[PDB]
Design a protein around this ligand. Structure first.
Ligand code: MG
Ligand code: MG
Ligand code: MG
Ligand code: MG
Ligand code: MG
Ligand code: MG
Ligand code: MG
Ligand code: MG
Ligand code: MG
Ligand code: MG
Ligand code: MG
Lengths: 106, 194, 199, 188, 171, 130
RNA sequence: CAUCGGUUUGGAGCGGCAGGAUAAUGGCGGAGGAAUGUGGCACGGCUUCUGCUGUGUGUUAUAGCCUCUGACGAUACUGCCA
RNA sequence: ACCGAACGUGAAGUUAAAGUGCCGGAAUGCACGCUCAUCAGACACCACAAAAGGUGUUAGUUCAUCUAGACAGCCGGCCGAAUGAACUAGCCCUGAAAAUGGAUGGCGCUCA
RNA sequence: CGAUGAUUUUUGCCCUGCACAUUUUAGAUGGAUACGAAUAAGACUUUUUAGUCGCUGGACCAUAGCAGGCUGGCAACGGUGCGCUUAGCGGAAAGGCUUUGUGCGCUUGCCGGCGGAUAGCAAUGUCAACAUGCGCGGGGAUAAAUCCUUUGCAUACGACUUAG
């Protein structure tokens, strides 16, 4: 009862980019404990939440969310590409996201 | 093109920047290296430059053309009334250098050294070191505790001493307070001496 | 692969640039890293070779004003810090925050002397260098180029290792007593079931 | 070429006990004990019996194989240092100025004091290494005997004494003065 | 490369003068049959007045190893070009397949002589039946009786970036 | 005596049992080079492999001639009963326990926690009185 | 969320068919042979012959291996599956 | 000005040339070797280095001596098994000296 | 970057126990889980002969209960949280690590009884540590610096050394 987590910990690592040009429409996400594309393919299609705090209350809450989804793997070390409704702000590079266990296929 | 002729540089690059000293009291950058086997003794003293004079002296320098012959020499007089010991500081060796751990003061400080801590002494209530003087109330166990801390942890012990500037002809009433490192003996020996 | 609150790396026996690159990517990705015992780090190549390299580094200074030029830090932690900062975009705000996520020390000062230090196998000298190659200890290179506090660190490291050995002897004794109690409570119904479950 | 395996065999005389643990050799004999660290070399040791020890290099290249017989020779020198000792004899060579060599003791330390070398007013002092004994030979005129269990220490004191007496600013083919090692043998 | 051994057979195009020209076979070590037929014409025009335009490829067949799980020693006779001249050499390789010995040879002359694939002619690959046929010591040292050797200083590959225990190299 | 500390390495020799892919057993039948060996086993394919791709186990199949064919290797493996010797070691037991743990379900993990609670109760009770 | 259509990236995917030296191997059988010669035998150095071991001999014995081959049976690889 | 590719405003997929330790998206990937530099080296155009040398190390070529005991060492013996010469070319080193401090782009890298 | 002196008789300041409300966050969401050293080596047992361990943390600890409610019993006399309390160690940046007794809870070690619905088939569905302010309560203390005049060890002016 000390733990209540139903999501996998993730991190916003980068945008999709070449050496000099970045593409904000695709985010690179590191899912915790995933080290290969085979592991990362479990999470394809899963929802992602970026939860953050804001100055103004909206309906009595100062907590806002940007929703996204895992679309494909990236590279060979288990990072995935994510697609959020609104692009994650660049300040969130290194910020933690939540990888939801739904849509479930277990 | 090169210089037509060579000449040495004017002045020393080892005394830069040629700026004003941060304080008028010269500070001992380095103290003599400590030898434990020697007796406990001070390594510095504060005085006041009075003036210059002339002496006559018989030279003892074999092989010199002035050997056993009178020489006339300039000399400097430094007025040095006795200094008063009022405190002790313990220093600890750290991977970042010496660090002062604790400063223990005497119960009574004279007015000339308590004026050191004031810019406007005449307008003050002269409250300096009054609560600290109260720390010596009938057992001085706070003082003994700090002294034990210095004995236990300090590697370099320096005393706090001030000049008795009222014994000089100077009109200044602020004493000059300085740290003088104690060399010789163990750390406990140094703390007991202070 | 877990996200840790702080990763404390024991820097002994680690190759400088390989540890630097791994730590750089860690702090860029939002991980707080502390590196202790930077005086025990290693650089491949003989000591004389690395000392010559550091003197090449010392040669470089702003001609018109030496106070503007590169600032050659002599401490082992600062040598590691220079290696990392060269691998970080330190002139951006993001790189500055990433560098705020990092701490480097000589020795193991508090509070890290009573915490867990890990190693990084991809940067370990004993696992990376061919067993005959020559290497340098950054503590000796630092002393050879101006670092003043080698003997203070080793005096404090010997004191720390004596205290940590008293710790370990106590922990081993309580581990022996707990193991004897688990042996006593073995072959019980719960133990047999946990053995059928793999525990 | 990466030679698959190379071996050398130490031979241990009857009264000598070699003792190896983590490339730290401790040789014990009638004459004392000697120790040597070999942690800078990758070699392995096998005790064949009480009289033989195998020293092995596995999959070693040319230089790493070369470092094997030197390990053998160093341990053998330790063995003969603790069972026979080492003795280097030095002869005093001078054309005009006699070399005045004394065994002095200053500050609790032994020194070899060379005076009048080529007439110089300078006094040369050589520290005597621990475990090394100096003696002015009685049976021979102008001879110094350097003896001890460690061959390295004995030869290095002898070399120090020889090197401190070098001639400067002269034709050293003509000015042959100095103190030279004439005999390298054993005490027994 | 990753190679196969091919039997390539070819001939001059028949003429009314010569209606059955002689059939010539070559053993070619090539990654595929396109390079096998290219190398065939490359060596035939070094050895005969023939071209691909005036010739004909008759057969291309893979030659599989006879005993792919029998350890052998091969001697390979080579003709390679250096930066300065042309040299003949003979080298030896240990392997279970003839193709894998030729692959090792190509890596070895790339490493020791900077000789590229284009600069090498394989004159001959022969399996050395007798232990006395082995001339080179770097392969003769593996033909000794009761050969044993350890593998000191084992480096274990980790899946994680950080390890909580001290590294070891026993094995 | 001399008292020389000797290495306890595992040797590359004919008869060494090795793990392949951390799953299957095999034995060395002939040495190719410093880097390559020929391995064979009842449940593996006879192949030339690199020693980096395998792990030497502390087990030797005794009296295996160099270059033995598959029939000989299988017969001697069955005679020496290498499978039981492997399965009796702590290494194989740890591999088996890892597999068994990986096959647990959520309900079984819950039961594991409950049984661990019971055993911890008993263990603390024994420790406090001894 | 479901189902569809268009585009597309995948799975430790599963099955069927074909080709090749109608794979080469391997396993089984037969014939021949050798050595980095197993047992045995004859000499030895250390072993209460305690994986004892070294050197000679010779050819399966108390291990085996190589070559050729006979009838089967697979697999790899490359293609095809509307 | 070279390589790739030529351009309306977008979404998804895949590539070219170039890359994948960090700066930087992508492997501290799999593999066979070579090299240790008290000025290593590091990628076309292109931003340099030669002749000549080295018992550094590697691999080759051709001669010659070899169990009818080769070379070395103690006086034919003695352990026993390889040895000598010339030559070829890989990497490394010498050759290799310029003026503000400084550039394989930087950090740094040595079974890379 | 450290040590140390003094810190406003103002309703201002310091320390402290709560209660409430706020702003910020380079980014809590069970636990940063403490020998040292070698690596051609370590650690067990006998014997220094030999056997055994590792071959990754896919570990260890913790983990059940309206984000965890209300009650009952059994077995043990243990485990754990909080509050006083005893003693010791730790100065590298110690600010933490142990420890005595006591009290109040809980205990999922085992067995019970009652409650959760409707938030509607998901919407972070809001649960943390740091800080500040504000109300109370309890303790505690009761300054200086600058301008100005002066000095001349100083000085273009600032600044500096003095004195008042
Ligand atoms: Mg000039
Ligand atoms: Mg001269
Ligand atoms: Mg002259
Ligand atoms: Mg569809
Ligand atoms: Mg067949
Ligand atoms: Mg072109
Ligand atoms: Mg990257
Ligand atoms: Mg040349
Ligand atoms: Mg050469
Ligand atoms: Mg050069
Ligand atoms: Mg570049």
């Amino acid at each position: 009862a000390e733990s209540h987590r139903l999501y996998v910990k993730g991190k916003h690592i980068s945008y999709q980019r070449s050496k000099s040009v970045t593409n904000p429409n695709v985010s690179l996400i590191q899912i915790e404990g995933v080290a290969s594309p085979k592991d990362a393919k479990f999470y394809l299609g899963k929802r992602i939440a970026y939860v953050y705090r804001a100055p103004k209350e909206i309906r009595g809450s100062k907590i806002r969310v940007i929703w996204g989804k895992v679309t494909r793997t990236h590279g060979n070390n288990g990072l995935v590409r994510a697609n959020f409704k609104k692009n994650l702000p660049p300040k969130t590079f290194g910020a933690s996201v939540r990888i939801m266990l739904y849509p479930s296929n277990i | 093109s090169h210089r037509k002729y060579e000449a040495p540089r004017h002045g020393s690059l080892g005394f830069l920047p040629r700026k004003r000293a941060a304080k008028q009291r010269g500070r001992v950058k380095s103290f003599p290296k400590d030898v434990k086997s020697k007796p406990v003794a001070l390594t510095a003293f504060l005085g006041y430059k009075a003036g210059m004079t002339t002496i006559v002296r018989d030279l003892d320098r074999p092989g010199s053309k002035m050997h056993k012959r009178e020489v006339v020499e300039a000399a400097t007089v430094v007025d040095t009334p006795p200094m008063v010991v009022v405190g002790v500081v313990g220093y600890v060796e750290t991977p970042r250098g010496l660090r002062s751990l604790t400063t223990v003061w005497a119960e009574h400080l004279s007015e000339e050294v308590r004026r050191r801590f004031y810019k406007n002494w005449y307008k003050s209530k002269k409250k300096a070191f009054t609560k600290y003087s109260g720390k010596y109330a009938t057992d001085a166990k706070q003082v003994e505790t700090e002294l034990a801390r210095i004995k236990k942890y300090a590697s370099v012990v320096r005393v706090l001493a001030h000049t008795q500037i009222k014994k000089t002809p100077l009109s200044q009433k602020k004493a000059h307070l300085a740290e003088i490192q104690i060399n010789g003996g163990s750390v406990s020996d140094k703390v007991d001496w202070a | 692969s877990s996200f840790e609150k702080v990763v404390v790396i024991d820097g002994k026996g680690h190759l400088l640039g390989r540890l630097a690159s791994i730590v750089s990517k860690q702090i860029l990705n939002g991980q707080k890293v502390v590196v202790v015992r930077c005086e025990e780090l290693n650089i491949s190549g003989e000591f004389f070779r690395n000392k010559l390299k550091y003197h090449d580094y010392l040669r470089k200074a702003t001609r018109y004003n030496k106070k503007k030029g590169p600032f050659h830090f002599r401490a082992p932690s600062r040598i590691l810090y220079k290696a990392i900062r060269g691998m970080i975009p330190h002139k951006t705000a993001r790189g500055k925050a990433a560098l705020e996520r990092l701490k480097v020390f000589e020795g193991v000062p508090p509070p890290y002397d009573k915490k867990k230090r890990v190693v990084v196998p991809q940067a370990l000298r004993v696992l990376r260098l061919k067993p005959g190659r020559k290497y340098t200890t950054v503590g000796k290179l630092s002393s050879a180029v101006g670092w003043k506090y080698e003997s203070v660190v080793e005096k404090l490291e010997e004191k720390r290792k004596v205290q940590s050995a008293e710790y370990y002897a106590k922990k081993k004794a309580l581990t022996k007593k707990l193991n004897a109690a688990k042996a006593s409570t073995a072959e019980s119904e719960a133990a047999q079931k946990l053995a059928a479950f793999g525990y | 070429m990466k030679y698959i395996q190379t071996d050398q065999i130490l031979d241990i005389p009857e009264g000598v006990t070699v003792d190896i643990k983590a490339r730290v050799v401790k040789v014990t004999g009638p004459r004392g004990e000697l120790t040597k660290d070999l942690k800078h070399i990758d070699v392995t040791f096998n005790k064949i019996n009480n009289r033989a020890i195998k020293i092995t290099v596995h999959n070693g290249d040319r230089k790493h194989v070369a470092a094997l017989r030197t390990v053998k020779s160093l341990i053998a020198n330790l063995i003969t240092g603790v069972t026979k000792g080492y003795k280097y004899k030095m002869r005093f060579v001078y054309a005009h100025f006699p070399i005045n060599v004394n065994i002095i003791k200053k500050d609790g330390q032994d020194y070899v004091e060379i005076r009048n070398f080529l007439g110089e007013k300078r006094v040369r002092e050589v520290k005597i290494h621990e475990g090394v004994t100096m003696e002015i030979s009685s049976t021979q005129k102008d001879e110094l005997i350097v003896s001890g269990n460690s061959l390295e220490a004995v030869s290095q004191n002898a070399a120090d004494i020889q090197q401190i007496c070098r001639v400067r600013n002269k034709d050293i083919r003509k000015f042959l003065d100095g103190i030279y090692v004439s005999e390298r043998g054993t005490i027994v | 490369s990753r190679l196969n051994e091919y039997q390539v057979i070819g001939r001059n195009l028949p003429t009314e003068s010569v209606p059955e020209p002689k059939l010539f076979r070559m053993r070619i070590f090539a990654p595929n049959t396109v390079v096998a037929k290219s190398r065939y014409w490359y060596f035939l025009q070094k050895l005969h007045k023939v071209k691909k335009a005036s010739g004909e490829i008759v057969s291309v067949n893979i030659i599989s190893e006879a005993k792919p799980t029998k350890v052998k020693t091969f001697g390979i006779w080579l003709r390679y070009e250096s930066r300065s001249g042309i040299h003949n050499m003979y080298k030896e390789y240990r392997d279970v397949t003839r193709v894998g010995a030729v692959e090792t040879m190509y890596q070895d002359l790339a490493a020791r002589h900077r000789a590229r694939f284009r600069s090498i002619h394989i004159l001959k690959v022969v399996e050395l039946e007798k232990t006395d046929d082995v001339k080179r010591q770097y392969v003769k040292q593996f033909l000794t009786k009761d050969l044993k050797f350890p593998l000191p200083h084992r480096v274990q590959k980790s899946k994680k970036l950080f390890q909580a225990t001290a590294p070891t190299t026993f094995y | 005596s001399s008292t020389v500390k000797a290495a306890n390495w595992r040797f590359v020799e004919v008869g060494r049992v090795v793990l392949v892919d951390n799953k299957e057993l095999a034995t060395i039948v002939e040495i190719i080079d410093q880097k390559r060996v020929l391995i064979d086993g009842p449940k593996i394919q006879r192949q030339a492999i690199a020693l980096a791709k395998i792990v030497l186990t502390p087990i030797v199949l005794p009296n295996l001639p160099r270059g033995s064919r598959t029939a000989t290797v299988t017969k001697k493996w069955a005679a020496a009963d290498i499978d039981a010797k492997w399965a009796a070691s702590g290494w194989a037991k740890k591999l088996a326990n890892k597999e068994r743990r990986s096959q647990l379900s959520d309900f079984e993990r819950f039961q594991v926690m409950v049984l661990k609670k019971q055993r911890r109760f008993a263990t603390k009770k024994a420790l406090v009185k001894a």
